[PDB]
Scaffold this motif. Structure first.
Motif, mmCIF file in Angstrom:
data_model
loop_
_atom_site.group_PDB
_atom_site.id
_atom_site.type_symbol
_atom_site.label_atom_id
_atom_site.label_comp_id
_atom_site.label_asym_id
_atom_site.label_seq_id
_atom_site.Cartn_x
_atom_site.Cartn_y
_atom_site.Cartn_z
ATOM 1 N N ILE B 63 0.681 -2.072 -0.098
ATOM 2 C CA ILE B 63 0.243 -3.322 0.093
ATOM 3 C C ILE B 63 -0.031 -3.363 1.490
ATOM 4 N N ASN B 65 -0.184 -4.100 5.569
ATOM 5 C CA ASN B 65 0.777 -4.959 6.510
ATOM 6 C C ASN B 65 2.330 -5.060 5.968
ATOM 7 N N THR B 66 2.575 -4.087 5.183
ATOM 8 C CA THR B 66 4.168 -3.745 4.670
ATOM 9 C C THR B 66 4.784 -2.817 5.293
ATOM 10 N N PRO B 67 6.026 -2.563 5.470
ATOM 11 C CA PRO B 67 6.633 -1.563 6.053
ATOM 12 C C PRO B 67 6.436 -0.116 5.523
ATOM 13 N N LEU B 68 6.059 -0.124 4.133
ATOM 14 C CA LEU B 68 5.923 1.407 3.599
ATOM 15 C C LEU B 68 4.455 1.654 3.546
ATOM 16 N N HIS B 69 3.517 0.976 4.004
ATOM 17 C CA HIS B 69 2.142 1.079 3.383
ATOM 18 C C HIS B 69 1.268 2.271 4.512
#
Ligand SMILES: CC(C)c1noc(=O)[nH]1
Ligand SMILES: [Mg+2]
Lengths: 149, 151
Positions: B63, B65-69
């Motif tokens: 997703i 703008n998330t930490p893992l993207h």
């Protein structure tokens, strides 16, 4: 010890994730299994059996995503599953302004020795359910003390 | 119908469901499947997950703008080993010039491993695969699933 370092790492990951969600008012529900086994609830979610990280916890609870609807259950220092069912409390003694996340947290705390963390989507307030009671409007330090205790 | 074969089929179904969802929403994604050349050095650059595969988890990871993207997900058999991993950037002249870093990373890892990497474009939603230094673009859902099944 290695066990002690691992517990502290996990507490730091949780508190970082909760702080980020509190700031953005992202609703979250995070149950930590203790002595009472919660397998029947874990089985209702999406299996993860994942290493804990603040990053993964945040990614789970993003609104309008597959995994954010339900509880994360943590067991043995791993995220066991996400999007799990928890039973809704029928207690008449929960603050009337609170909705189903908080009632689910209280509900699971009525029938297990687990500790559940709730972030409100309305306020960003952080609370903890244990033993059938909800402890509201926690500071960061308060949540950490509960996790250490 | 051995358990290993059934597990592979469940993993392929999870991947294809996730990729189809992201493609429809123009969610950029970069997903490398380790094969016989070990990818440990790259896995170690990311956030460790060691998680069971699900379409839900794959989608959540990417997703925006998330930490893992940002960065690659690297899968090892039926697990998501790590997310937000570094992959080396290809300097191949056969990468369409309009393509961004995800496609260049995918081709880059495919030049130094036998892995299979899937890319979803954030610009178009197009799905591509990198293998053995070659990028194959604009894949249909059917073609992706057949490529995964053959791998
Ligand atoms: C260290 C402690 C708070 C913990 N968090 O998840 C766990 O399984 N244990
Ligand atoms: Mg073509």
């Amino acid at each position: 010890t290695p066990v002690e370092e691992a517990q502290q790492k996990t507490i730091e990951a949780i508190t970082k994730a909760i702080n980020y969600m509190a700031k953005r008012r992202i609703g979250a529900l995070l149950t930590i299994e203790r002595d009472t086994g919660m397998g029947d609830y874990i089985e209702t979610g999406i299996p993860l059996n994942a290493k804990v990280s603040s990053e993964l916890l945040i990614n789970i609870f993003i609104p309008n995503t597959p995994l954010h609807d339900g509880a994360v259950i943590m067991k043995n220092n791993e995220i066991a599953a996400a999007a799990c069912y928890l039973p809704l409390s029928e207690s008449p003694f929960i603050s009337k302004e609170l909705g189903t996340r908080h009632r689910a947290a209280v509900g699971i705390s009525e029938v297990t020795d687990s500790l559940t963390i709730i972030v409100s989507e309305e306020t960003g307030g952080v609370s903890v359910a244990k033993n059938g009671d909800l402890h509201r409007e926690l500071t960061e330090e308060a949540l950490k003390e509960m996790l250490e205790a």
